[PDB]
Design a protein around this ligand. Structure first.
Ligand SMILES: [Mg+2]
Ligand SMILES: [Mg+2]
Ligand SMILES: [Mg+2]
Ligand SMILES: [Mg+2]
Ligand SMILES: [Mg+2]
Ligand SMILES: [Mg+2]
Ligand SMILES: [Mg+2]
Ligand SMILES: [Mg+2]
Ligand SMILES: [Mg+2]
Ligand SMILES: [Mg+2]
Ligand SMILES: [Mg+2]
Ligand SMILES: [Mg+2]
Ligand SMILES: [Mg+2]
Ligand SMILES: [Mg+2]
Ligand SMILES: [Mg+2]
Ligand SMILES: [Mg+2]
Ligand SMILES: [Mg+2]
Ligand SMILES: [Mg+2]
Ligand SMILES: [Mg+2]
Ligand SMILES: [Mg+2]
Ligand SMILES: [Mg+2]
Ligand SMILES: [Mg+2]
Ligand SMILES: [Mg+2]
Ligand SMILES: [Mg+2]
Ligand SMILES: [Zn+2]
Ligand SMILES: [Zn+2]
Lengths: 169, 107, 117, 186, 109, 292
RNA sequence: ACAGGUUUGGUCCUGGCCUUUCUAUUAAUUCUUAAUAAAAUUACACAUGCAAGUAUCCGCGCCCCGGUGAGAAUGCCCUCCAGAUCUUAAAGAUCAAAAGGAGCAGGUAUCAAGCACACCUAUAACGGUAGCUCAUAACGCCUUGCUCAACCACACCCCCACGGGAAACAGCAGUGAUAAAAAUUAAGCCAUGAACGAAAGUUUGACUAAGUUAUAUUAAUUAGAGUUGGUAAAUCUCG
């Protein structure tokens, strides 16, 4: 895209690439950030780059942002229990905020890998269906089997009307 | 490009197609070229081609005659570049024009 | 869709290119169509004998029994199939077709030697 | 049928040079974009139609799996995939014959294609398992027993049979059922 | 352990839009949505009524809504849980001091 | 004793024997190309990148498991003669369950003979190949493995390709696997082409089949002609590990051993053509006194 | 789009229109045979024959398949499950009504306001507040099946069927009228699926195998149609 001042962040590639996934407890996330100060600087970047990464990967988590309410910048987190997490981001680097969040409510790499494997096991090689869900379809295809008459017309013997006209006579 | 000897190229043209502006444009552009040697020289670093077919193998193309810098270069999570909406639209599978993927005769 | 009733049923859906039948073993609702919706696919069956002279049957025994354990019903040809494999005891009607066929073959031997005479 | 010959001929070497076949050939068509697949066949019976393909305008060319020097120039050198007819300009018939040709060519290895490094099928191969290793054959097998008592035909009590006839009396079809044991026939 | 609400709303935060009813707060929620053409995130808003014992919500409040286990009315599925920022009086979660905007009213020391 | 391919000695010696050639390891492939990616690097970054390369190349280089042959498995699970009279062609019952190791799958058959037989090995494999299609494998055996096609592919010096074909198509414990691998080794031996498979992951199979065929000839000759002493060293070392008790082994070991003494004593005690070794083992030696 | 033709005496620039690619009906001109897929103008009216039976009573089945796209901006997606049925040593399983909501969802703002569309009392059906929706498109109007291993909706019409018009093929074949739109008043339950059966088994216009049709691919036995100023392959003589 052309318009926008960091257009690379309106990509799909930039969206998939951001990594934080949230635990199942997180529901709401509240970013309170500040416009004017040097000590705000990191937080801002986080909103401007990382917030749109985060959200994409967690489409069900409300992410809200307030400006200039509180004189010092922070994150809040509202979990399922009624647990309220409070993450102070001040002189932090943008990267530091990201990784800190990942630490606190993340998902272990193993967790993700497990889950994706548990979904990948759902589509089984051996079934037969429409090209959408399966690979192979009619078993026209597989080598040793019979060729399906569209491609390779069948023996006079195996036709219905051959059997019919033979059983009649 | 057959007269230059360029055998592989993708080129799309936008706006007015008038012949003269086109050839002038093309020639300005292909003389606008920055060579690997020149890139190397201005940045004083090695330039390294990563082929996909050859895997991770880090082929060197160019070396900075004179002093090779001892300085690594900034890796931004966020590069700032002009991005053409057409390339990015291509990237995500959003070019659906029936004319595009056509078979055409040889070069 | 929403139905009045019916049971979970394991059976043979027929995909085929016509004169070349083939089947997909399927865990379905009784009240859905033959080739329509199902819960889960289980196996396949290929009636027509291949290059090697074999009739291929794939079955997921783990899942098949997961559903019978949930009380799915078997169609009679799925039971012929499960019979042969030995996952299930041979089906009574198989044996009866055996006896019938043997008796007719003996009667036809006697017809053969009564026509020869 | 001998392939190699015409590709090394002085006639060929004169005509085509070291450029591929089809190089100079050009397919005439209605506009800027040619129809997405070329003509069905350029030969029907004794008649050669219009401006013929590279392959069929020259009859001395033979499409086989044998001549690699002919089939080579219809495959992309770097990509190792064949060209669709329009790239080249061959007719559909000769193009299907060319695909099928390159296939048997690669099946006899007369040609190169890319062969990837594949790992072994299995990770841990243990021949030990009971599916692989012959089991302890059934106690029912050792005796020569039918696997269940009901595989065996048992002639029923005369009581049950006559009461059975007594049930169905008007509709009964009664013919002896001992199951002759050996199958084969004329 | 069964107390549930079939609604995905389970916990939200929104501004307090209006007080016009008895012991019921009109609260606007705003979530980010990815506009697929542009690939950008915009603020989509949605209003939720909520229930209040104290009738404690001034307009403009940043409020935490909790899903209610059994819905009161067609239009009330929530209960105000906590006031996150009462308007015009905001006490910094970090330092626990009274503040306006960028400035502390009573500083450390 | 217990020597085998997967022993650490045999492994580290066969990795060192094989060698890292980043040009032959990573080579242009015929797949549809993409435009090349470029980046500017430091000396440091290029070194780290180089090591990264070498690390990844090792994984490419990992040896295909060698194994002994499998015996035919014939066992009948049941017999009912009553079914036999059905006179229907063979039925093949496969289990497809996603959790199972493919040697732990159950593959069964009922013939027209009214018996329940387990699947043969080839049969079993082509079954799993049907329902668990894996790339490169034909479900019916590919023509190219006929002797004619074999010789044709050898002529073209493609041997890496053939050995890469069997890895995918057959199974490492199969009959055909062994027939083709071993016959192919015979070819590189009679043609002296050994340096082909050098940087290949196939090298381990070269070394083994030969140590166990006890013809080390061409590989030693070649190694000394290629100016590689250390490889011939570790190779004789290997013949000593896979032949601990023999005249050559215990004698040329316990007497004394190093490059000159062990390579020349195993050049005298392996007589296939000891005249070849002794010739070349002179030449390299001479070519040292001129270079030093 | 790899683009091409076309504004002017001419040149750029802006800017429509058209060509060139692929699919589908229908028509005209031609047409040899197979095989395979597909078959369709019409919620207009319907002659006749059939499309549910099973079974020792009772029971169970009897728009389930099958047909259609008339209706409705319908709905996709996601929560949560009453009920029905199946299995069974009481808890599993399959459908899943109602009710909901993160988000996505036809055109039109010359449709801009709608007109009670809210809440509070748990007192136990009365009282109390004065609200709710809406320019991030309420409320209208217009057109419409669909996001398709399927899902939604209808079943002569009056959204709904008590009652009223009135006597219903939008099951299979067929037929009038209508429309640019044309398949057999065909044979079998032999396979599958379904309903009943304790069972052999019985029924099934589902389906199976056919029949008709250049409608599309494939193979050959089949040669014809269109073009020939330019874009755009290709021309001589007459009138
Ligand atoms: Mg003008
Ligand atoms: Mg003019
Ligand atoms: Mg003028
Ligand atoms: Mg025009
Ligand atoms: Mg027509
Ligand atoms: Mg329907
Ligand atoms: Mg439909
Ligand atoms: Mg309509
Ligand atoms: Mg409407
Ligand atoms: Mg609307
Ligand atoms: Mg529901
Ligand atoms: Mg108007
Ligand atoms: Mg009142
Ligand atoms: Mg009605
Ligand atoms: Mg009535
Ligand atoms: Mg009607
Ligand atoms: Mg009809
Ligand atoms: Mg009806
Ligand atoms: Mg009519
Ligand atoms: Mg029609
Ligand atoms: Mg009938
Ligand atoms: Mg038909
Ligand atoms: Mg046709
Ligand atoms: Mg004719
Ligand atoms: Zn098929
Ligand atoms: Zn041709």
């Amino acid at each position: 895209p052309m318009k926008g001042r960091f257009p690379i962040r309106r990509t799909l590639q930039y969206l998939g690439q951001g990594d934080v996934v949230f635990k199942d407890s997180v529901k709401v996330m509240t970013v309170n950030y500040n416009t004017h100060g040097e000590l705000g600087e990191g937080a801002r970047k986080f909103v401007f780059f990382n917030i749109p990464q985060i959200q994409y990967k967690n489409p069900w988590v409300q992410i809200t942002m307030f400006k200039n309410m509180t004189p010092s910048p922070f994150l809040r987190f509202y979990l399922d229990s009624g647990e309220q997490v409070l993450v102070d981001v001040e002189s932090k680097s943008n990267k530091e905020i990201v990784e800190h969040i990942r630490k606190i409510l993340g998902k272990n790499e193993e967790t993700l890998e497990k889950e994706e494997q548990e979904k990948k096991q759902l589509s089984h090689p051996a079934h037969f269906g429409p090209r959408k869900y399966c690979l192979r379809e009619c078993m026209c295809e597989v080598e040793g089997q019979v060729p399906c008459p569209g491609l390779v017309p069948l023996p006079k013997e195996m036709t219905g009307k051959y059997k019919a006209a033979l059983k009649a006579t | 490009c057959r007269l230059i000897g360029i055998k592989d190229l993708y080129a799309k043209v936008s706006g007015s197609v008038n012949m003269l502006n086109l050839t002038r444009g093309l020639f300005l552009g292909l003389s606008r070229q920055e060579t690997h040697q020149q890139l190397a020289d201005k940045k004083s670093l090695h330039v390294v081609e990563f082929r996909e077919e050859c895997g991770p193998l880090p082929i060197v193309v160019a070396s900075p005659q004179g002093a090779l810098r001892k300085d690594p270069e900034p890796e931004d999570e966020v590069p700032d570049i002009t991005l053409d909406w057409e390339d990015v639209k291509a990237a995500q599978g959003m070019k659906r024009s029936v004319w595009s993927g056509l078979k055409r005769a040889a070069t | 869709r929403a139905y009045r009733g019916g049971h979970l049923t394991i059976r043979l859906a027929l995909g085929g290119c016509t004169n070349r039948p083939f089947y997909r073993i399927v865990a379905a609702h009784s009240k859905c169509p033959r080739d329509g919706r199902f819960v889960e696919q289980l196996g396949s069956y290929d009636p027509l004998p291949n290059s090697h002279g074999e009739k291929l049957v794939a079955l997921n025994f783990d899942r098949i029994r997961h559903w019978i354990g949930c009380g799915a019903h078997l169609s009679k040809p799925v039971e012929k199939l499960l019979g042969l494999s030995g996952f299930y005891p041979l089906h009574p009607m198989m044996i009866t077709n055996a006896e019938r066929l043997r008796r007719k073959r003996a009667r036809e031997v006697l017809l053969a030697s009564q026509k020869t005479d | 049928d001998e392939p190699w010959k015409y590709l090394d001929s002085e006639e060929y070497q004169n005509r085509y040079g070291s450029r591929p076949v089809w190089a100079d050939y050009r397919r005439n068509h209605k506009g800027g974009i040619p129809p997405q697949r070329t003509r069905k066949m350029c030969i029907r019976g004794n008649k050669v139609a219009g401006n013929p393909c590279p392959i069929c305008r020259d009859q001395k060319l033979h499409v086989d799996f044998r001549n690699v020097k002919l089939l080579e120039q219809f495959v992309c050198a770097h990509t190792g995939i064949i060209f669709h007819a329009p790239y080249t300009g061959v007719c559909m018939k000769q193009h299907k014959k060319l695909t099928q040709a390159i296939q048997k060519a690669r099946d006899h290895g007369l040609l190169r294609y890319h062969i990837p490094q594949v790992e072994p099928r299995d990770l841990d191969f243990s021949t030990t398992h009971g599916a692989v290793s012959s089991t302890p054959p059934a106690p029912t097998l050792v005796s020569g027993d039918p696997w269940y008592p009901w595989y065996s035909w048992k002639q029923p009590p005369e009581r049950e049979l006559s009461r059975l006839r007594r049930l169905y009396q008007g509709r009964l079809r009664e013919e002896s059922g001992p199951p002759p044991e050996l199958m084969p026939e004329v | 352990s069964i107390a549930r609400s079939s609604v995905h709303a389970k916990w939200v935060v929104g501004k307090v839009i209006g007080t016009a009813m008895q012991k019921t707060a009109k609260v606007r929620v705003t979530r980010l949505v990815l506009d697929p053409y542009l690939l950008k995130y915009f603020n989509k808003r949605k209003t939720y009524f909520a229930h209040d014992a104290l009738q404690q919500c001034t307009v403009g409040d940043i409020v935490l809504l909790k899903a209610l286990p059994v819905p009161r009315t067609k239009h009330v599925k929530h209960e105000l849980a906590e006031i996150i920022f009462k308007v015009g009086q905001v006490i910094d979660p970090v330092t626990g001091k009274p503040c306006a905007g960028t400035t502390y009213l009573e500083s450390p020391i | 004793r217990k020597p085998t391919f997967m022993d650490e000695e045999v492994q580290n010696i066969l990795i060192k024997m094989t060698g890292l050639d980043l040009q032959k390891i990573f080579k242009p492939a015929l797949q549809e190309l993409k435009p090349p990616t470029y980046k500017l690097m430091t000396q440091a970054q290029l070194e780290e990148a180089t090591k990264q390369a070498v690390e990844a190349a090792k994984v490419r280089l990992k040896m295909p498991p060698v194994l002994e042959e499998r015996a035919p498995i014939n066992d009948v699970l049941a017999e009912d003669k009553i079914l036999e009279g059905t006179e229907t062609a063979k039925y093949v019952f496969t289990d497809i369950s996603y959790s199972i190791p493919h040697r732990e799958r159950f593959i069964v058959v009922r013939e027209p003979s009214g018996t329940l037989r387990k699947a043969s090995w080839e049969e079993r494999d082509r079954m799993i190949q049907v329902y668990f299609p894996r790339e490169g494998r034909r479900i019916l055996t590919p023509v190219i493995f006929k002797e004619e096609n074999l010789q044709t592919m050898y002529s073209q010096d493609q041997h890496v390709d053939v050995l890469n074909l069997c890895v995918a198509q057959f199974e490492p414990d199969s009959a055909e696997y062994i027939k083709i691998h071993h016959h192919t080794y015979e070819d590189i031996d009679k043609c002296g082409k050994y340096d082909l498979l050098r940087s290949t992951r196939h090298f381990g199979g070269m070394a083994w089949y030969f140590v166990n065929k006890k013809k080390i000839d061409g590989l030693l000759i070649d190694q000394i002609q290629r100016d590689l002493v250390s490889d011939a060293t570790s190779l004789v070392h290997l013949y000593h590990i896979l032949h601990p008790x023999x005249x050559x082994x215990x004698x040329x070991x316990x007497x004394x051993x190093x490059x000159x003494x062990x390579x020349x004593x195993x050049x005298x005690x392996x007589x296939x053509x000891x005249x070849x070794x002794x010739x070349x083992x002179x030449x390299x030696x001479x070519x040292x006194x001129x270079x030093x």
